[PDB]
């Protein structure tokens, strides 16, 4: 990025039992723009493949990931946060990498 995109932040709230790990994610935008929905992107290192989802249009591309949060569940002003969750299965390894990337801008984990 030869300019100065955003740099929001998304935290993770995992909650698994035998292997299925839920994921309570909370976005945090502090850049400086009216976030009326968005599409972040990154990927799952281990075999973390999401299945269910709400308040977030998740999409696993082979092994990577992307989430198009609807406009309603994504109507937060540059000074606020958003939140969504899903249920993915794994095998016991590393999931949430680090700084994902909003639709056109980076985003450091929370």
Curated annotation (Swiss-Prot):
Similarity comment: family membership: Belongs to the glycosyl hydrolase 10 (cellulase F) family.
Organism the protein comes from: Cellulomonas fimi
Shown part of the complete sequence: 375 to 484 of 484
Domain CBM2: 1-110
Tree of life domain: Bacteria
Disulfide bridge map: 8-107
Function, as annotated: Hydrolyzes both cellulose and xylan. Also has weak endoglucanase activity. The biological conversion of cellulose to glucose generally requires three types of hydrolytic enzymes: (1) Endoglucanases which cut internal beta-1,4-glucosidic bonds; (2) Exocellobiohydrolases that cut the disaccharide cellobiose from the non-reducing end of the cellulose polymer chain; (3) Beta-1,4-glucosidases which hydrolyze the cellobiose and other short cello-oligosaccharides to glucose.
Note: The linker region (also termed 'hinge') may be a potential site for proteolysis.
Record's protein name: Exoglucanase/xylanase
């Amino acid at each position: 990025a030869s300019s100065g995109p955003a740099g929001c932040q998304v935290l993770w709230g995992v909650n698994q039992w035998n292997t299925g790990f839920t994921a309570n994610v909370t976005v945090k935008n502090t850049s400086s723009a009216p976030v009326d929905g968005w599409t972040l992107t990154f990927s799952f290192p281990s075999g973390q493949q999401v299945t269910q989802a709400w308040s977030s249009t998740v999409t696993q591309s082979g092994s990577a990931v992307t989430v198009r949060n609807a406009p309603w569940n994504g109507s937060i002003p540059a000074g606020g946060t958003a939140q969504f969750g899903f249920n993915g299965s794994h095998t016991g390894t590393n999931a949430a990498p680090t700084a994902f990337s909003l639709n056109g801008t980076p985003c450091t984990v929370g």
